[PDB]
Amino acid sequence: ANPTTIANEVNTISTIGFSSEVVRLNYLKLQYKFRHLKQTSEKFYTSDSYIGD
Amino acid sequence: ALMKNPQQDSGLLSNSIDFRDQNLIFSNSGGVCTSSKDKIENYPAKGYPYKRGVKLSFGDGTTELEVEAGGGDDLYGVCSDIDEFSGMATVIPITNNFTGYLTLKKVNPGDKLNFNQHGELEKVSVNAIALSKAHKLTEDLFIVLASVFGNRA
Numbered sequence A: 001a002n003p004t005t006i007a008n009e010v011n012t013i014s015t016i017g018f019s020s021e022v023v024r025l026n027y028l029k030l031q032y033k034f035r036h037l038k039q040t041s042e043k044f045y046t047s048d049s050y051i052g053d
Numbered sequence B: 001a002l003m004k005n006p007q008q009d010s011g012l013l014s015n016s017i018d019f020r021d022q023n024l025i026f027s028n029s030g031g032v033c034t035s036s037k038d039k040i041e042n043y044p045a046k047g048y049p050y051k052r053g054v055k056l057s058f059g060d061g062t063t064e065l066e067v068e069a070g071g072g073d074d075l076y077g078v079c080s081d082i083d084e085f086s087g088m089a090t091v092i093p094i095t096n097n098f099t100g101y102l103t104l105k106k107v108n109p110g111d112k113l114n115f116n117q118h119g120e121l122e123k124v125s126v127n128a129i130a131l132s133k134a135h136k137l138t139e140d141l142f143i144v145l146a147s148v149f150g151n152r153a
Helices: none
Strands: B041-046 B054-056 B068-069 B076-081 B087-095 B100-106 B112-115 B119-124 B124-132 B141-152
Touching: B041 B124, B054 B112, B068 B076, B100 B119, B119 B124
Parallel strands: B041 B068
Antiparallel strands: B041 B087, B054 B068, B054 B076, B076 B087, B100 B141, B112 B119, B112 B124, B124 B141
């Protein structure tokens, strides 16, 4: 409501209310798989120009 | 003329020796007996409703509601004090009882009094019981000690 003037004596004052809002956020996990060369087997593919097959 | 504190100055200092019959003045704001659990509300004043019953008055809608002198079925409370600078009248609601001096229409202890259209008490719905006889402060100003106990037929 409108404000209350503080003049002489008064007991009833205007009020301030509060409110809340709740928001949900979802999180998802995903995975990918990839093939590669074994560390011990890299030495058998380490060519001079490049490493790999 | 009718304001709580006279605008005309006093020529002489008062003699503060006696202690009897020094409270039946128009400047006596509030009540003779007051509790700490009394509800009081300030409202914008339309006219001069001091020491009179007040009723709620509504405008076109641009401005807020106010209180004006009156009684009857429209009575909302009793004005016990006023601040002139802010034009704010302190009102005790009819739901709360009050004991003090109120304006009487221009009467013995035990008489039943109701508020008229001008917010003045008059002998008989019953709104208050007179606790004393009418005390004259001016040719038209008559006060009376009354006890207001709400609405009852």
